[PDB]
Symmetry: C3
């Protein structure tokens, strides 16, 4: 490919008053691929639209003075940010300072400023020298994410029209127009995962007892759903659908690291997550914030949704702090004011358990970004 | 892809005399993809042919001594260069020093040397330690640029055979063999751009008055060229030709930032410049050096040409200093000596207003790299 | 593409005892593409499976204290490694420290730890601040290398069935199933390379005298093999086969830099080595370790094999130290114990001059990775 980035340097020495922080007004450009700098805003390196992650670095050269300290610092949007360099050291002769940042995320409109500080008697000269430069590099570029402005979820297999949590039900939901299928998983006596909602299988299947009481093979062989359909495991569903379908997955409210570890291993084995996966092909939700944090610490690219029944500004702020992709409040608690507030904060709002066309239309008017509907065709009836 | 770069390290400690600058004679290679190092020139990391931009970094480890200062410095071609690291700090214990360069341009034959300096009593040992290494990385690789050794420009739409500055004229020039079409632009009463040469439209069109006196719509609707052809705007020409054609554009001699800003916005909107554009698909010329500098500060990849009528070594040196791609002197002032001098400096020479076959042949013998010819087929008659 | 890497940071300040080295127990993740960090091993950044080269960097922020020194250090697998940063400097105020590593090789399971050291009175606080982070980036990813688990070499052109070192012989060996053809080269009176085994051409060709006595043209025109076949030069063989075939090349036991330089130039001219080449499409062997070192210093990606007749642990250790790909001991000296020892060290074992099916089967039972067989079809008779 071709390098994307820019580098700027001074043409005349800048004077730094003693013990005062000062962004450097860079004057000329060594090179600039596309609009990384603006003449009317010399102190700022601006990130253009088509960039997601950048690397920033610079170097400094002062006039000969062996007193006080010198500082090299880079600020994002005029304030501190993660992954930026910072250096202080004793000054001898010109006391050059060099620093480089790690790969950090950014968005259109973000800017970086080179900040300098000195503690020597009198003013100091920020020399315009080949060893005095400010550079920014683009590491990641925007690309199609498979995301949709509105997402329709086949709530628990679209059981409103057929049996719940079965391959036939998932296929019917996809045919009816489901954007995402919802999967509920529990561990059997073995480490394998079984697709069911209730902890006890008696409600949904001819069998009885907890899912963890017996092995996966016995449960899948000796028992079947009330409609006689097979009880598919996670591996079976993944093999049947593969990458053709986007999956919505819920974890246990009672947090357990083994469940998340097994789910992540199974998902990575099929390539649905990780280096070779698509960002939005899989979405994970959970009432347990700890499970979401654990998943994020391992796979940060996986979008996460937080399930709650107390939609409020506190919950939205908490979700924004941890970087969750969306918040899933109960539909009864949603109002246009809260939806607008969430959109301002950058969070997506999904209403779950929507089963009436009038309520669906009201939520659409409220601007809700997605629904978990047991009945799917009502969306077409709007 | 695969990583391209090299890293070298010492096998025996090097002795650095007090207060003397010394390139480090590196002895062994940790890894080297392709000819980045030479045994007979240990102090130099050499850039192979197929590289355009590189990143250089290194680290140092000295013997235990808490007196004086230590220096880390990298030189290009034995002299200072932009974007290279430089560090000095007080020495405690081994006083390791680390530095990294930004992305900088290079060409085949360029080399980088690791320079060290110390100010402690007696000699110091440049220890051969895993924390003492010199590395160079390749960021950008050479690729097809769409450039041509000789460029024929359809001077102002090849008006010698048809009407000037119209879509039909541009198409005729392209058919006759024009490599680049020349566009002259002025702002209307609105911010839109109109393709014309003279400030007043009476000479070229049935209308009259300055282009900025009235809006684009009125000018394009109520007026037409003396041949009855439409008066195309920049957007119309770009839509008609798109990326199929390479454009030559001239800016106003009286510098005005609004003109350049609008031109750049229009060009980027079509993808002719910026991240996704081809380097040589667009060329910009101007008598105003300030306009060229302003364009370069925003889009450094766009080749720039300087129009002048006083071809001299001073102008060539000035253009080389600002990094212009070519110089466009008047054909009457061109001589083989000056063409050879320009080629030695690395600048391309384009002769403008060439309308005779004998003069064209003479200039070709002089080695001129391109012509702005009102009559195009004469080039085929050579 | 998409960025692959991770960055971690502290959530609570860590206390560093005076004059003690301490890996930093990082607590939270800023971002992590795929399994670069583990909660139960906070101090370690772990390299996943699909990575070959990485870049590691970090930054530190201490509490305000102007006494003693501060250290920034990164360790690989709990010990020192090449290409990692190291910095010590005098402390003023918070004394931030920044460092970045060069591109270094890695393998699955390798981990990096951030080590800190301070020499101030009392304990120091490793502040959890946006300017305190630990990052690792992936530069190179695993890709198909064209390598094979077992390699069959057409020993000196498979002369057992036809004439040695001729295009017809090489083609016959390839047809019979040869994975690699073996080439023996010597310099003629000119710098060109001639494909022959013996220094004197009388044994293999109708001519006589040393290869260097006369020019390539005279040797190739006035002389022919005992079977009347042409005496091909290296360029002729490369043109005839090009990239369709993988080459095995041997250099002179008496080291001479001119031979290696000419061979490398010829190979690069055809693209068989360098930036655009495939790693395992060419293999070079030599009895002279100096020649292998010289080739490695210029092209580190070329796999190298060491020819010896004294198979022993000392030779395997020496080859591992210099990073040779394989060791080629005499078949009579090979035993399953030594093959297992070589495999534990990571070296491949090739037995040369194997011309009996029983010995070939015995070596296969020993686990030998390849054979140089004058008779090829015996491998199919196993």
């Amino acid at each position: 490919g071709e390098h994307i980035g820019a580098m700027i340097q001074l043409e005349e020495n800048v004077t730094v008053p003693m013990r005062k922080y000062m962004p450097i007004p860079w004057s000329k450009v060594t090179y600039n691929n596309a609009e990384f700098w603006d003449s009317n805003n010399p102190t700022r390196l601006v990130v253009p639209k088509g960039i997601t992650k950048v690397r920033v670095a610079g170097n400094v050269l002062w006039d000969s003075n062996a007193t006080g300290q010198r500082m090299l610092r880079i600020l994002k949007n005029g304030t501190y940010s993660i992954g930026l360099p910072y250096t202080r050291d004793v000054a001898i002769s010109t006391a050059p300072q060099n620093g480089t940042s790690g790969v950090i995320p950014v968005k259109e409109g973000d800017y970086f400023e080179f900040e300098a500080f000195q503690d020597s008697e009198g003013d100091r000269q920020f020399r315009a020298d080949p060893y005095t430069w400010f550079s920014i590099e683009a590491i990641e570029l925007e690309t199609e994410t498979m995301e949709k402005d509105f997402m329709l979820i086949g709530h628990r297999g679209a059981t409103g029209y057929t049996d719940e949590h079965t391959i036939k039900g998932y296929q019917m939901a996809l045919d009816k127009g489901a954007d995402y299928i919802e999967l509920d998983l529990q561990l059997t006596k073995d480490n394998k995962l079984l697709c069911m909602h209730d902890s006890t299988i008696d409600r949904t299947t001819t069998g009885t007892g907890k899912v963890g009481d017996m092995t996966l093979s016995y449960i899948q062989t000796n028992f079947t759903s009330l409609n006689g359909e097979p009880i598919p495991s996670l591996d079976d569903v993944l093999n049947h659908f593969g990458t053709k379908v986007k999956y919505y997955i819920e974890t246990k409210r009672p947090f357990d690291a083994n469940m998340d570890r097994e789910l992540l291993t199974q998902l990575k084995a099929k390539g649905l997550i990780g280096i070779g996966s698509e960002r939005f092909q899989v979405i994970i939700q959970s009432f347990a914030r700890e499970s979401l944090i654990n998943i994020h610490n391992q796979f940060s690219n996986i979008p996460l949704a937080y399930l709650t029944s107390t939609f409020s500004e506190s919950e939205m702020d908490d979700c924004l702090s941890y970087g969750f992709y969306a918040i899933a409040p109960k539909y009864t608690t949603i109002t246009k004011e809260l939806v607008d507030l969430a959109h301002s904060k950058g969070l997506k709002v999904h209403a779950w358990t929507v089963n009436t066309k009038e309520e669906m239309q009201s939520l659409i008017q409220m601007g809700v970004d997605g629904f978990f509907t047991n009945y799917l065709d009502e969306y077409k009836k709007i």
